[PDB]
Design a protein around this ligand. Structure first.
Ligand SMILES: NC(=O)N[C@@H](CC(=O)O)C(=O)O
Ligand SMILES: NC(=O)N[C@@H](CC(=O)O)C(=O)O
Ligand SMILES: [Zn+2]
Ligand SMILES: [Zn+2]
Ligand SMILES: [Zn+2]
Ligand SMILES: [Zn+2]
Ligand SMILES: [Zn+2]
Ligand SMILES: [Zn+2]
Ligand SMILES: [Zn+2]
Ligand SMILES: [Zn+2]
Lengths: 362, 362
C-alpha cells in the first residue's frame, strides 16, 4: 500500500551548470531530484559564471530549459557590484541569494552596507534568502528590520541559530528558515567515519546538542531543503576539499524514516517540503503531479546513489525505511523504481507560468 | 491596471442550506463568494438538520453539488452523541467543527470530556476547528495537548485570545487561528450606529484595544475568514436576534483598503486568504483559477451587497478602495463587474478531487 504525496519542492539545490558539469548538470541533478520524490527545484546562483547579471541568467535559463527533467526556478546572486541593476529580471528569478559567510562561492559581500543596498534595491515583494551562520543570522535580521522586509535563512544548523530565529519569531519578525537533512541526521559523531575531506560542509556538522535542538525546535523550521551540493569524490578527498554534500536522493528517505519512528508527522513533513516552500517563494502548483512512496521498505544507503554525478554520499550505511516508487509530473510518468522516464528538457521554468509570477501592486 | 490574485479561500462560511434557505442557500452564498473574489469555501455544519452524521453529510453534499457556483468543502459538526461514529466519512469533510460556547448552534458540548472524546476519536490527520472564546481558547488548547494534536481556533476577536495564542506559539504548540473582518474593521465604537440587534455577533465586537491588538499581532493570525453568517434584516432587528454578520462580499474590499493604506502587505493578505488556508486544511489547488482586482477604485459600502440573501451589511457607509473586477474559475469566467456568470452546480466538492484528499499513513 503506497502513500500518495503531492509534488515536493526543494528550495535549495546546486545543479552546477554552467561551469561545474563534472559535478552535476541540470539533467543529472534533476534526475536525482525525481528519484528523491522532488518535482520542483530552486537552483542556486554560485555557478561558473555565477548568475549575477541578466546575460548569465538568460544563459542559465536556456541551459535549464534544455536539461532539466523536473520543474525549476533559478536564483539570482547578490554581488558587490550588482545592487540596483537586477530590477528588470528580478521577477523572473526564484529570489535573490546573499552569501554572507565563507563557503563554496566567490560572491561574499565585504560590508554590511552592501547587504543594506541589496535589501533596499531588490524589489520588496520578491524573496531574499541568505547564507548566514551564527551571529550573521542576527546581523542579517537587523538589516531586514532596518529595511522593513522579510528574510529567509538558509540551512540552519546550530542550536544558537534556531534559538535566535525562535526569539525573532516570538517578536513577530518576518523571518523564515530551512534545515537540511545532514544537520538533522549527522553530527560530530560522524566525522570519524566521514573523514575531514568528505565531512567538509557549510555550515559545518553540528554537535549532538545542535542536532537535538533542531529536532526540539521543529516548530521553528519552515522548510526542509537539501542544499544538494555535489562535488566529486576526487574533490572531496583531495587537498583543498570544497564544502558540500549531495542530498536530493537521500532527503526524503531519511525524513520518511523519521516519520515512521514518530519523530515528526507526515503533515509536518509535507508542510516543510511542499506547502511552506510554495508560500514563501510563491511557487505555483504543478497540475497532475504526485509522488508515491512505500513506507515499509527497509534498506541501507549505499556508497553512492544512482543519479547524482557526485557519486558519493555522507549517509552511506544509514538504515532507512521509506522509498520513492513512482513520480508523475504534469501527467507523465517521470520516475519508477530506479528509472527516470522523462528526458532532459521536460522540465520548465515555473516563473514563466502565469500562476508562477509573484503578485505585486501595480 | 488590474492585479491578478490566485483563487482565494474562505475557510469559514455559513451557507444555510439545508434548512435556513431564506437566509442564504448554496447558490446565493457562492454567488456572494465569487463577487468577493473567493473561489473556494468551507461551509459550516450548523444547518437544519445539522451536518452531524453520515446521512446529513450525504444530503448536504448533493445540495452543494447542485447549488454551489464555486468550489467547496463541507465541515462535519461535533455533537454530544457522534464521537466515534464519523470515521468512515471524516476524510470526505473539510474537518470537524466544535462549538464550545453559546452561539447560533444547537451543537454545544456540555463537558470537556466530550471535547476529549472528539479529539481522541476523530482521525488524527484531519483538521479540527473550534469556536472557542476567551478562556475557552486555553481550555481547548489543553485538550489538544492532552491528546497530542493540533487545533485551529475560529474567529479570534480579542486581545486576550490573540495573546494566549501568541504565547502558545512561542512554546511551539501546534495551534493556528483565523480572524474575521468585522473584528479588524468594527468595534464597540460602531454599536451606536449598528444598534443592539444588527450588532449581535459571536464573538461580540471588541473594544478599540481588541482591534488594535489584532492588528499589532498580525504575525499571529494564520488566516482571514469571513464567518459569513447571513440572517435576514427581519431576524437581526427582531425580538430574539440571531448573532452573525454577512461578509463574503465585503471581506476582500475591506482588506484591500488596508493593503492600500500600508496596514499589511499584499503578501500578508495572500498568505491569509490563500496559502495558509490551503496548508492548514489540505485544500487542493484550483487549476486555471484567478481573481483580478482594481486597487484604485474608491466606493462606499451600501446598505446591502448584491448577492447575499441577508440583504444587509454592518459595514454600510465605510469607504473602501479596491474592487473585484473578474473571477475565472477552472477556465470559465465566473464573475465580471457585478454579474455572476457560472450557474448553480458549477462548483465541486474539492475533497473528491484526487489532490484534495488529506494525506495519511496507511
Ligand atoms: N553548503 C556547502 O557546503 N556548499 C554549497 C554552498 C552553500 O550552500 O553555502 C556548494 O555550493 O557547494
Ligand atoms: N458568529 C455568529 O455570530 N454566528 C454564526 C455562528 C458562529 O460562527 O459561531 C452563525 O452561524 O450565525
Ligand atoms: Zn550556503
Ligand atoms: Zn537556502
Ligand atoms: Zn547551498
Ligand atoms: Zn503565492
Ligand atoms: Zn463560531
Ligand atoms: Zn472557523
Ligand atoms: Zn461561524
Ligand atoms: Zn496538503
Amino acid at each position: 500500500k503506497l502513500v500518495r504525496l503531492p509534488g515536493l519542492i526543494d528550495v535549495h539545490v546546486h545543479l552546477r551548470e554552467p561551469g561545474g558539469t563534472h559535478k552535476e548538470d541540470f539533467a543529472s541533478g534533476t534526475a536525482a531530484a525525481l528519484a528523491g520524490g522532488i518535482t520542483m527545484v530552486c537552483a542556486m546562483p554560485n555557478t561558473r559564471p555565477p548568475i549575477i547579471d541578466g546575460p548569465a541568467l538568460a544563459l542559465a535559463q536556456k541551459l535549464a530549459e534544455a536539461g532539466a527533467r523536473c520543474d525549476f526556478a533559478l536564483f539570482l546572486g547578490a554581488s558587490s557590484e550588482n545592487a540596483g541593476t537586477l530590477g528588470t529580471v528580478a521577477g523572473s528569478a526564484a529570489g535573490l541569494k546573499l552569501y554572507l559567510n565563507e563557503t563554496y562561492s566567490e560572491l561574499r559581500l565585504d560590508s554590511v552596507v552592501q547587504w543594506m543596498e541589496h535589501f533596499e534595491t531588490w524589489p520588496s515583494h520578491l524573496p531574499i534568502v541568505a547564507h548566514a551562520e551564527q551571529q550573521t543570522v542576527a546581523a542579517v535580521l537587523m538589516v531586514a528590520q532596518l529595511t522593513q522586509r522579510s528574510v529567509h535563512i538558509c540551512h540552519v544548523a546550530r542550536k544558537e541559530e534556531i534559538l535566535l530565529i525562535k526569539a525573532a519569531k516570538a517578536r513577530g519578525l518576518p523571518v523564515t528558515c530551512e534545515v537540511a537533512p545532514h544537520h538533522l541526521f549527522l553530527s560530530h559523531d560522524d566525522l570519524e567515519r566521514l573523514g575531514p575531506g568528505k565531512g567538509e560542509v557549510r555550515p559545518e556538522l553540528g554537535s549532538r546538542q545542535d542536532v537535538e535542538a533542531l529536532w526540539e525546535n521543529m516548530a521553528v523550521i519552515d522548510c526542509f531543503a537539501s542544499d544538494h551540493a555535489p562535488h566529486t569524490l576526487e574533490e572531496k578527498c583531495g587537498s583543498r576539499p570544497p564544502p558540500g554534500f549531495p542530498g536530493l536522493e537521500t532527503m526524503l528517505p531519511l525524513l520518511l524514516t523519521a516519520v515512521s519512528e514518530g519523530r515528526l508527522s507526515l503533515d509536518d513533513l509535507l508542510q516543510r517540503l511542499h506547502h511552506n516552500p510554495r508560500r514563501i517563494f510563491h511557487l505555483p502548483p504543478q497540475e497532475d503531479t504526485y509522488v508515491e512512496v512505500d513506507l515499509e521498505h527497509e534498506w541501507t544507503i549505499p556508497s553512492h546513489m544512482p543519479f547524482s554525478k557526485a557519486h558519493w554520499t555522507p549517509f552511506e550505511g544509514q538504515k532507512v525505511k521509506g522509498t520513492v516508487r513512482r513520480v508523475v509530473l504534469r501527467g507523465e510518468v517521470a520516475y519508477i523504481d530506479g528509472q527516470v522516464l522523462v528526458p532532459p528538457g521536460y522540465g520548465q521554468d515555473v516563473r514563466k507560468w502565469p500562476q508562477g509570477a509573484v503578485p505585486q501592486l501595480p
